[PDB]
Design an enzyme around this catalytic site. Structure first.
Site, short mmCIF file in Angstrom:
data_model
loop_
_atom_site.label_atom_id
_atom_site.label_comp_id
_atom_site.label_asym_id
_atom_site.label_seq_id
_atom_site.Cartn_x
_atom_site.Cartn_y
_atom_site.Cartn_z
N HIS A 62 0.83 -1.24 0.00
CA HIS A 62 0.00 0.00 0.00
C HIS A 62 0.84 1.25 0.00
O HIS A 62 0.35 2.30 -0.41
CB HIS A 62 -1.09 0.00 1.11
CG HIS A 62 -0.62 -0.35 2.51
ND1 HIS A 62 -0.57 -1.65 3.01
CD2 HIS A 62 -0.24 0.47 3.53
CE1 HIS A 62 -0.17 -1.58 4.27
NE2 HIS A 62 0.00 -0.31 4.61
N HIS A 92 6.40 7.00 5.80
CA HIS A 92 5.92 6.59 4.47
C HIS A 92 5.27 7.82 3.84
O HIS A 92 5.09 8.84 4.50
CB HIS A 92 4.95 5.40 4.57
CG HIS A 92 3.73 5.77 5.38
ND1 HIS A 92 3.70 5.66 6.74
CD2 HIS A 92 2.59 6.36 5.01
CE1 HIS A 92 2.52 6.15 7.19
NE2 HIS A 92 1.80 6.60 6.14
N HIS A 94 2.03 9.14 0.93
CA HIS A 94 0.86 8.90 0.10
C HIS A 94 0.96 9.87 -1.08
O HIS A 94 1.44 11.00 -0.91
CB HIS A 94 -0.48 9.20 0.85
CG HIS A 94 -0.59 8.48 2.13
ND1 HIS A 94 -1.26 7.29 2.24
CD2 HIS A 94 -0.09 8.73 3.38
CE1 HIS A 94 -1.19 6.84 3.54
NE2 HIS A 94 -0.45 7.68 4.24
N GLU A 104 -3.37 13.47 1.71
CA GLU A 104 -4.50 13.00 2.50
C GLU A 104 -5.19 14.18 3.19
O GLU A 104 -6.37 14.46 2.90
CB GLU A 104 -4.02 11.95 3.54
CG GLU A 104 -3.48 10.70 2.81
CD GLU A 104 -3.63 9.48 3.61
OE1 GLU A 104 -3.20 9.45 4.78
OE2 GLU A 104 -4.18 8.50 3.07
N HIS A 117 4.25 10.98 6.12
CA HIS A 117 3.85 10.68 7.49
C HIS A 117 5.01 10.10 8.27
O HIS A 117 5.45 8.98 7.92
CB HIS A 117 2.66 9.69 7.50
CG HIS A 117 1.40 10.33 7.00
ND1 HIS A 117 0.34 9.61 6.55
CD2 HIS A 117 1.12 11.66 6.83
CE1 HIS A 117 -0.58 10.46 6.16
NE2 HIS A 117 -0.19 11.73 6.34
N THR A 196 -4.87 6.43 8.90
CA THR A 196 -5.57 6.62 7.65
C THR A 196 -5.62 5.38 6.75
O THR A 196 -6.22 5.46 5.68
CB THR A 196 -5.01 7.80 6.85
OG1 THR A 196 -3.72 7.40 6.35
CG2 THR A 196 -4.91 9.08 7.66
N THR A 197 -5.03 4.29 7.24
CA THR A 197 -5.28 2.99 6.59
C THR A 197 -5.79 2.07 7.69
O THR A 197 -5.58 2.29 8.89
CB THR A 197 -3.99 2.38 6.00
OG1 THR A 197 -2.94 2.36 6.98
CG2 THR A 197 -3.52 3.21 4.80
N1 LIG Z 1 -1.19 6.72 7.35
S1 LIG Z 1 -0.96 6.84 8.93
O1 LIG Z 1 -2.15 7.30 9.59
O2 LIG Z 1 0.31 7.49 9.24
C1 LIG Z 1 -0.75 5.25 9.50
C2 LIG Z 1 0.39 4.65 10.16
C3 LIG Z 1 0.00 3.29 10.38
C4 LIG Z 1 0.66 2.17 10.91
C5 LIG Z 1 -0.05 0.99 10.99
C6 LIG Z 1 -1.35 0.82 10.45
C7 LIG Z 1 -1.99 1.92 9.89
C8 LIG Z 1 -1.29 3.10 9.89
O3 LIG Z 1 -1.74 4.30 9.37
ZN LIG Z 2 0.10 7.62 6.17
#
Ligand SMILES: NS(=O)(=O)c1cc2ccccc2o1
Ligand SMILES: [Zn+2]
Ligand SMILES: NS(=O)(=O)c1cc2ccccc2o1
Length: 258
Positions: A62, A92, A94, A104, A117, A196-197
């Site tokens: 992803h 990571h 997006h 996002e 992020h 957000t995932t």
């Molecule tokens: N995209 S995020 O909100 O930074 C995010 C980090 C993250 C780690 C594990 C599972 C879902 C996740 O979602």
């Molecule tokens: Zn993220």
């Protein structure tokens, strides 16, 4: 898990297996810059990455994650809206199929080409898996990317991508300095939200920097050559791996700056 960002398993479908998707503190959100209140009580952020130890880069199907050693307090986020100390676990991005979408969060409905992020977890809960079960378990530093001049400190990430093209591939990624991905100013917006995932847990204090970083077209083009699929499977370019803005509901976005 069979969620993704395709035509039949994208964000509008996630609620069927992760019902929290329709919760009351979901992320990302649109940041209305006129409605966000300056909070003179918010402190400067403390980003302490001098001792960061990057270890590995992973295509997880992803996005790609740059993973750090989070067995000790080596790269931590403190201050700002936070109580306590949050350890960097991974970063990571997006991004979009074209420069007009990819982030996002949005700012007065503007989409940036990508969003970084930097994910951190609250050491009072001992491990990441416990931290995601807590409303103050994580702090995610979000940084917008716009396309213009190259970001010199991103190039080492770009150049390794060709070695982790497909889901499940990883490559040693030591000695990478994430300070090279920050903008000049640490002014920010903050609000309580979620991952957000999937699993979309409501465990994040979001800290979104106002100032984007600039990356070149060529840098983001290389992000878009990654694949969602595994080796030898039908090629699905890893693009548009972003969730849309969610309802703000009963939340306030505070600004660190006047
Ligand atoms: N995209 S995020 O909100 O930074 C995010 C980090 C993250 C780690 C594990 C599972 C879902 C996740 O979602
Ligand atoms: Zn993220
Ligand atoms: N609700 S979900 O996790 O996004 C999910 C969507 C979906 C569509 C087809 C097959 C399996 C699926 O799993």
């Amino acid at each position: 898990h069979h969620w993704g960002y395709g035509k039949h398993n994208g964000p509008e479908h996630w609620h069927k297996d992760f019902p929290i998707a329709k919760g009351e503190r979901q992320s990302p959100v649109d940041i209305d810059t006129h409605t966000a209140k300056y909070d003179p009580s918010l402190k400067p952020l403390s980003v302490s990455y001098d001792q960061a130890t990057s270890l590995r880069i992973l295509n997880n199907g992803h996005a790609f994650n740059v993973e750090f050693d989070d067995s000790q307090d080596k790269a931590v986020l403190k201050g700002g809206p936070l109580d306590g100390t949050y350890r960097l676990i991974q970063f990571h991005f997006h991004w979009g199929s074209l420069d007009g979408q990819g982030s996002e969060h949005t700012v007065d409905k503007k989409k940036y080409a990508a969003e970084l992020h930097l994910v951190h977890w609250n050491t009072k809960y001992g491990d990441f898996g416990k931290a995601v079960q807590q409303p103050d378990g994580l702090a995610v530093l979000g940084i917008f990317l716009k396309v213009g001049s190259a970001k010199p400190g991103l190039q080492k990430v770009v150049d390794v991508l060709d070695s982790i093209k497909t889901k499940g591939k990883s490559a040693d990624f030591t000695n990478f300095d994430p300070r090279g991905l920050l903008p000049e100013s640490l002014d920010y917006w903050t609000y309580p939200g979620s991952l957000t995932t999937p699993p979309l847990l409501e465990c994040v204090t979001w800290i979104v920097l106002k100032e984007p970083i600039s990356v070149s077209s060529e840098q983001v083009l290389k992000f878009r050559k990654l694949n969602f699929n595994g080796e030898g499977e039908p090629e699905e370019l890893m693009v548009d791996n972003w969730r849309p803005a969610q309802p703000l509901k009963n939340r306030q976005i505070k600004a660190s700056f006047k």
